[PDB]
Amino acid sequence: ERKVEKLLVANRGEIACRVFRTCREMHIRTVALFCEAERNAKHVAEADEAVCIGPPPAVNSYLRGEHIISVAKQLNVDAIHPGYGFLSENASFADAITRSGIEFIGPPASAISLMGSKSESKRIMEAAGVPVVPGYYGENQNVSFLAEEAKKVGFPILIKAVSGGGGKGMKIVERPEDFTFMLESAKREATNFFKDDRVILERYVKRSRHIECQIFFDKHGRGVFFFERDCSVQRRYQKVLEEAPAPHLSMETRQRIGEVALQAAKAVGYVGAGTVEFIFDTSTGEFYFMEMNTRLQVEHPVTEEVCRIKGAPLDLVKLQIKTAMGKPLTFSQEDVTLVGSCIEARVYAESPERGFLPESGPLTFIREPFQGVRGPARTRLDTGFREGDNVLIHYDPMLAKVISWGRSREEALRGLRQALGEYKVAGINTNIEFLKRCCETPEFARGGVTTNFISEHESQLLKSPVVTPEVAAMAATAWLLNRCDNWRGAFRLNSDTNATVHFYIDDHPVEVRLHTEGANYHKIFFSVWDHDGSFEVCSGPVTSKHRDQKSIVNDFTFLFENGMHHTVLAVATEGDVTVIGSFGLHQLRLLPLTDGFGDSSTAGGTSTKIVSPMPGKVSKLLVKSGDLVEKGQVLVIVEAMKMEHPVRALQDGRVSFLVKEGEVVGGDHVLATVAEEE
């Protein structure tokens, strides 16, 4: 075999740190890669050496496979792990690595190329004999052929069409012995949706739940399938929350899922770690092949919590290095046993209220949930970002992954709830509120959720706590104090103090007024939305005198008269005030009040504009008539004894020319009328 002492990573993020960590235990060197800048990132602070690769766009960075290979050769690298994304699925890169002599980590290039095309892949599995639900059989040569194979090839009837998602030819015709309505439905589908007259028939499944078993193989002909998985929950083809132990799955089935999966991988030949994905209908009770991926998934640490080998913790990445080592395995499929249950959820730096659009901004304060064992449950968090970091728009929005291992499902789900609640980030809106809403009200604790489970409950979700009038009181107070000495040393005569804050909550401005009575800075009141009360407030140490973009992060205490007390860590800026406490997190936008403060001119500008002196001789006018002029460009240039003396009018609005180039004009002539755009 070939010794390995240097490890190379392609991608960046959580996978970089994960690959780097175990490496320490195996006692192997590490190498990091980073784009323009991106040098303060954590992963590079974790490796032994890092190299800059070039411009931010993914074409420029992490896609120059030849340059990466040349750099690795110069470094005499032993192994490369592509990870997921970028060159994860590219057979040319793997072949070039093999020619260079470096041990590529993953499947051979032949498997990747074969699975690149869906038609040839499904051909291979059909030859292998695995139950596969195909996409098409022939064409609509005859309408009687539809009745011929309707009860033949596939009893379930999937009429549909050659293409297009309209699918009005379907009509949900699950009843066999249908011969006068299927042809009428197809012919009415052909109208206004002719496309190609060829029609394909398949089996139609009422329900769908996604399954995906894991597999592992050495290069000495020996492997063992890991435990199954579930990915029923996904929105817009994006993974949201998943469970390694498919609840409600019989043991016997588990076993069989393996025999089918091993047949397919052996047929194409496979080395390393991979995952086979199925599609399943509860009503039919059978699973049909949909797709496979020849690449390590992102969901690898999840399935790990439900599998132990020889009573020892399993490390998936470890074996992949050992597989690259050339050593053979040590365990049969038997040594592996499941223990308990676990759940996972992904947090995305997106805004749930909006069109789930990514946002980029500095990370102000990041709470870290307790990543230790307690009670009947294990909870962990893996994050590819830390304090002081900033999200890049080029990358996908992905902060951290939270997993709750437990002895029973209940324990696991309950654990997450509390953890999901505890983790807190300030600075960018996240979908963390959405995930908690997905966990509390939906009765998916039973364990039965379909592929389209998210679609129906959209009305129930997308809901957040209501900002109580009290929340404005602590939020408003923090912005003042966390900016200046408002209410500090203040003093007037025979009167009392007053200071107000305007919040632009939703599309309606909000005003909050704060004032004091007595000689007390401590005793304070409030009146928001016609609700009045009293409270006292005690601050903490003063921090962040520089009041930069991060501004001031301080803890606050508020004793309201009723009797309560509160603690609030407020990082306030001019744009917004963020308050985090037992209520949760809420950011209140401050009413924006900016509008070219100075240049606010509504003057008509009717006549006598950019008038030229006596000599005249206007020429070389470079402004179009009827075009807005707010900045002071040279509207007209007139020459008086070689005196260009450009007028440079700054009156806003479009300018209308009444003169032409080369025309001698009199003194103080109306060359143009600079009027407000009407």
Partner: protein, 566 residues
């Protein structure tokens, strides 16, 4: 009306009107200008290198400098012979003397550039510098003036450009209360141009006058005697709080070794005639006797230390400050500058330049709707409040009034002034003359000259005529002057003088084409033969020459130079 802030937000935000937002678009016009500028700086930045290590440029590719080819071997031979003696032939004494990690200015550079025409028609005197090098230096936490006599004695020690440079340095030090350090190496005098340099006033005697007037005001001065200083040059070692004589090659004489011959010519060793006499002679002349160049420089530094100025400078100029850069890239300064040699005056702007130079790209406009020609307002330059007068167009009476008002406020509140010179631009209209324009011009010049505020001017371009009297000029005591490459200093008219003087000079009505060839072309050649590169600096007219891109650093050096003042 639905608007109720507390002034900030409106202020202390990245959106205050105070700033400026002129963003260029890099179009042909920009290219034409930006490119030319580049065409106006490369050699400026280059000749400097050639005079530096003067006459020895091993690359031999100095075609970017129009300097004629010189005998490199002769200069290298002279330098080898001089360095074999044991003394460092370079400006090396300076950067050895100044603390590492600190700044320098090089006040006057390219001095005496191709000044004198020799008997050989194609040959000029090879004065790569003025014979000395002058710059502001910070020694041991103390700001000082540094004057070093170059070892170029081939033409003669001192010229009408050398003594003027020395006297300018002395006047600057006295005005600013910066102690001086002189590095003395001389060939005596120049017995060829002696009438031009010895007698009269503002000559070699005024050096001796200044070295005593300074010590009256208790501004200690230091001189180092590396080589001979004869012919009245021996008084500076005598008139000095501290002086240094090198053990072997340091010599001071009132009468030359040839002079003892033909008048009791009992010749003896040059050591006994007044050189470094380390034998405990009766003479108590010369404070320090140092065995080596490094030893002498070290003792100079040690003497500079014991002056107690460190506390005063540290209090007055904060050493630990946070630099605030402008909002726009300083490389763009060359672009807004128009091209050159254009029949009719091209267009120009100021806002962009000030927004590029000042801190935070901000400004404090006074009345700009009124007297739209002239620009005046406050600013910030590296932690110090500044006033700027930059000229744009043809001056009116109202522009002069606004200038007088601004200068009045600046003098009232003790705010320094910066000047950015431009065209003369005095209208000649009869109504304007009838409107008492002369009185308003006098109003402006009176305030300009009367101001006790420190004043610095820098040439933008096109400073020709008596208009500078309105803004500022060398004859109005500017404590520093610096220049950009595209500068022309000439008669009241740069282009019009051609037209006017065409009419009134012994011209027949006929032969018009031959006459305009003989008149207009000739006067154009005369009035643009002068320029930034030759007529200025080389003659110590506006002694400083700089780059347009690095102006703010230079002006900040100047302002720190003018706060030790009483």
């Amino acid at each position: 009306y639905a608007h109720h802030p507390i002034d900030y937000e409106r202020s202390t935000s990245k959106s205050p009107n105070i700033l400026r937002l002129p963003a260029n678009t890099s179009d042909p016009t920009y290219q034409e200008n930006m490119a030319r500028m580049e065409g106006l700086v490369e050699q400026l930045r280059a000749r400097v290198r050639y005079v530096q290590a003067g006459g020895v440029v091993p690359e031999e590719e100095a075609a970017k400098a129009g300097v004629s080819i010189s005998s490199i071997e002769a200069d290298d031979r002279v330098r080898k012979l001089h360095l074999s003696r044991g003394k460092m032939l370079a400006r090396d004494r300076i950067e050895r003397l100044i603390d590492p990690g600190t700044r320098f200015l090089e006040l006057s550079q390219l001095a005496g550039w191709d000044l004198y025409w020799d008997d050989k028609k194609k040959e000029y005197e090879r004065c790569y510098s003025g014979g000395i090098v002058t710059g502001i230096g910070l020694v041991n936490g103390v700001r000082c003036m540094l004057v070093a006599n170059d070892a170029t004695v081939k033409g003669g020690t001192y010229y009408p450009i050398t003594v003027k440079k020395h006297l300018r340095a002395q006047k600057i030090a006295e005005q600013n209360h910066l102690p001086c350090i002189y590095l003395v190496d001389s060939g005596g005098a120049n017995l060829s141009r002696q009438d031009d340099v010895f007698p009269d006033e503002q000559h070699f005697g005024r050096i001796f006058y200044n070295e005593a007037q300074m010590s009256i005001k208790s501004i200690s001065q230091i001189a180092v005697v590396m080589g001979s200083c004869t012919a009245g040059g021996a008084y500076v070692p005598a008139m000095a709080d501290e002086n240094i004589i090198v053990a072997r090659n340091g010599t001071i004489f009132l009468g030359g070794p040839p002079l003892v011959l033909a008048a009791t010519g009992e010749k003896v060793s040059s050591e006994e005639l007044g050189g470094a006499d380390v034998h405990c002679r009766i003479s108590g002349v010369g404070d320090h006797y140092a065995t080596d160049d490094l030893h002498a420089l070290y003792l100079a530094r040690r003497a500079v230390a014991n002056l107690n100025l460190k506390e005063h400078n540290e209090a007055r100029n904060p050493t630990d400050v946070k630099p605030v850069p402008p909002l726009y890239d300083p490389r763009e300064l060359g672009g807004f500058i128009p091209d050159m040699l254009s029949d009719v005056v091209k267009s120009f702007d100021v806002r962009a330049i000030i927004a590029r130079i000042v801190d935070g790209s901000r400004f404090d406009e006074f009345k700009a709707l009124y007297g739209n020609t002239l620009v005046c307002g406050f600013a910030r330059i590296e932690g110090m409040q500044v006033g700027i007068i930059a000229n744009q167009g043809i001056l009116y009476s109202e522009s002069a009034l606004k200038g007088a008002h601004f200068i009045g406020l600046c003098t009232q509140r003790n705010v320094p002034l910066l000047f950015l010179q431009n065209i003369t631009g005095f209208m000649v209209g009869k109504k304007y003359e009838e409107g008492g324009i002369a009185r308003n011009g006098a109003r402006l010049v009176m305030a300009v000259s009367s101001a006790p505020v420190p004043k610095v001017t820098v040439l933008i371009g096109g400073s020709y005529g008596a208009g500078n009297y309105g803004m500022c000029g060398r004859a109005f005591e500017p404590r520093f002057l610096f220049m950009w490459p595209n500068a022309r200093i000439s008669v009241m008219g740069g282009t019009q003088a051609a037209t006017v003087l065409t009419l009134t000079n012994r011209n027949l009505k006929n032969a018009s084409e031959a006459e305009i060839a003989a008149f207009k072309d000739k006067v154009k050649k005369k009035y643009e033969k002068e320029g930034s590169c030759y007529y200025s600096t080389a003659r110590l007219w506006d002694d400083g020459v700089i780059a347009p891109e690095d102006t703010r650093v230079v002006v900040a050096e100047a302002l720190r130079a003018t706060r030790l003042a009483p």
